[PDB]
Symmetry: D2
Subunit: 258 residues, 4 copies
């Protein structure tokens, strides 16, 4: 019968929408650390995932990614290997180890959306805009003190998040929530339901120098009251940097069996 890593199944397996991991990623990030209501954050954490050592720590993350499979084949089709993304990250712990929970994420390409659900990452579809550094001319900012970088998310035609970073300095200190394991819930609707708590296993994590400065972040109505509960109480530092990793698969944290 037909086969494949994913649908659609086909006689040779080549038609599958997704390729088996590992996948490599190289991206550009614009990120704002912020303070969330810890009581609201707790309600997005499933059983086994406990409040951060700093329960109020969150982040809003804009990124643009290029990705490919182990053979690098997607790289020659920039239309197939690129996507933009906006995510929320919440600080948490599993058995005393710091992690990040991603309660919400939006992307602008279908393959990364479906591949997100594969790993338990709750990706939906949206329109994501992000400033890029320039090195010539005047139409933009440089990676240098005073440089400003903006991000915006619209979902279903409504502008729901805007963020800005004005950088002051370069550091080798990665933003905390972008240098911990991500703990997701693997679950898929039952058509004819055993959620599992899992962590994504990554290797070869690499950061450019991090440009950091002041952050600004605003949420707007249009995603519902549940999302609104994660709006910033206060906004902290912003970071602009490049990031790479190899994403290998999942490790089971808990299947909630007894």
């Amino acid at each position: 019968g037909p086969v494949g890593y994913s649908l659609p199944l086909s006689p040779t397996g080549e038609s599958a929408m997704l390729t088996p991991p590992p996948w490599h990623f190289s991206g550009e990030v614009v990120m704002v650390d912020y303070r969330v209501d810890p009581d609201a954050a707790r309600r997005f954490l499933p059983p086994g995932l406990e409040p951060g050592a700093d329960p109020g720590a969150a982040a809003a993350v804009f990124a643009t990614w290029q990705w490919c499979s182990q053979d690098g084949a997607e790289l020659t089709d920039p239309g197939r290997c690129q996507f933009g993304e906006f995510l929320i990250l919440l600080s948490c712990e599993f058995e005393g180890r710091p992690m990040a929970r991603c309660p919400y994420a939006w992307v602008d390409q279908a393959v990364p959306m479906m591949r997100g659900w594969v790993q338990g990452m709750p990706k939906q579809f949206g329109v994501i805009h992000q400033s890029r550094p320039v090195t010539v001319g005047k139409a933009g900012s440089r990676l240098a003190p005073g440089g400003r970088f903006d991000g915006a998310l619209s979902v279903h035609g409504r502008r729901v998040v805007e963020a800005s970073v004005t950088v002051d300095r370069s550091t080798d200190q990665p933003p905390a929530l972008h240098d911990v394991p991500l703990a997701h819930t693997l679950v898929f609707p039952e058509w004819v339901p055993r959620p599992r708590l899992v962590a994504s296993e990554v290797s070869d994590v690499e950061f450019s120098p991090i440009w950091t400065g002041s952050g600004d972040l605003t949420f707007f109505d249009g995603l519902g009251d549940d999302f609104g509960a994660l709006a910033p109480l206060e906004v902290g530092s912003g970071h602009v940097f490049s990031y790479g990793e190899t994403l290998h698969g999942g490790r089971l944290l808990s299947d909630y069996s007894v």
Copy 2:
């Protein structure tokens, strides 16, 4: 902990991308029946699904849909309740009962894509164009003898299917492959794998008068050799009609257990 019919989980369950079934559909269809190589068709049928009483019968189906949940809430946001689709259908049987297998499908909205995978329908993302009947002016065709209606699919920026129907007459005979149960394979990649063969349960199936005439159908390179194997040997009748149904859930055909 947070809940929901699907990701993202949230404290009240409202953030979920998908709503529980049943879902209602009302659509406009442009469909071409064609002859496929029966040996190529057989290779797309999983265990338990056997060749049609007419193994060579296939169809190419363009449709535009409006859909909503039981409460009808999506209908007031046309941007959320509409999508376009192109599908291939192959004739098959399960335990002596005629069904259709959908080996390939493309849609232009994320919610229907993910909801397709929920039901085992192998939807990917593409750009789908479809002619619409007009009732005034000269810029189009009427639902009347001589009226022509076109469909086109581009995937990753490549034009891969084009079809046309010129209708001759109205009938009350639904196209065979659009009036049988659909048999899908429920399977999702294993991140840390028990495919199931299922049929979609529908009710309240309704057709407009069917306008039927000559069909034309062309495949072009750009989807791979596996897809190419399903190219038409011969092209038969085309049909233009409206269609409604309520989609309730799955029934298990086989879980391949022993």
Copy 3:
């Protein structure tokens, strides 16, 4: 040199890009035929605000406060019908504002703002003086089978929405009650546009679009709802509804031929 014509040298075309045979041109010469589906809401505008969008030569409407918000989806083609076989090339959606005005005692409509979702109609709009910009436009379509939508029948509801640069800026709804053969007033009068294009190295002209073979389906009418939201600026905001009137759902056809000069201001 740019007109295909006797002894012409350079490349030619009705529009850019010019090419040796003229086939490359983005636009085709008129006439163009249109067949569309409309969801329209009549509303009351501040007449003093409306007046400031009317160029010299155009006087306030017989009812100066009469306006309309118009959602439409179109199919179009040139005389040879060639575009109709490529639905991806011959379809677009649109949202327009219309204001009641008059030229020398004759009712017309001014379109101060329009958004479309395809480039060819956008440019062709500028050619005729219609001020089209790009946006995302959604519109309900009647259904005839199933439950997922409304029928053209009493109680049927039809919605429209416009987003521009990722902000939701107009939402409209009509719930129809009854059918009539009375076309909405602002959809059955000449449109008066201003022809002007930026100077790179301007002399505006007031023109009317000449159309023929105007055709309406039966008109389904009932209550309208209309809301403007921030994101298009205060100039646009001045045209927000004071009160919202009847909504209309109908099909429309016409042939558009070219422009007639109302004034070149000499």
Copy 4:
């Protein structure tokens, strides 16, 4: 009446839509600043075919067969920089063909075809005579961390693709070998355009775009590859490569001010 200026009556603006304050206009007055990333392939074109795209006044290039296929992504803003805070408003991608030509002994480039993926740049292109249509344009970006891409270093590969109306019509690749400070010839000369807009109720002018503060990063050069596919018509097809030369990857900036008249054909 359409210029904001002393005693002006009607609505005003640099372009449509006109409005009481002029704020609604789709376009802003120049100058505009550009900062971009380019992936370009030099190629050999049929010189006799190229000649037919050159209007009177423009002579064949010193090397008549020299052409280029250019992929670029841009950020742009007006003098006040206001657009830069809305990345969704200030970015676009582009694919262009360039042909070598001369005006009165001076090297220039003719752009017979261009496609962009945003409406404002499309219209602003027509304003300056650059024949821009709408398309989908993809372009590799260098990476500096990780494995999912190429570095600006020997062996780095960068790709570009154009689809128009859902058909894949151009694909290009560069594999870079070495860095240089020598800008690609067709990206460091004035562009000579034809100003023409359809008449609704045409007098073309040959113009050059005036730019300042032209700036190149170091240029990464190596082998180029370039393939045209059917779907843009035979006029465009005539410009397909006979042979493909060097590819170049670099960053580019300039300020664009306005047009200079080369000939109004009087």
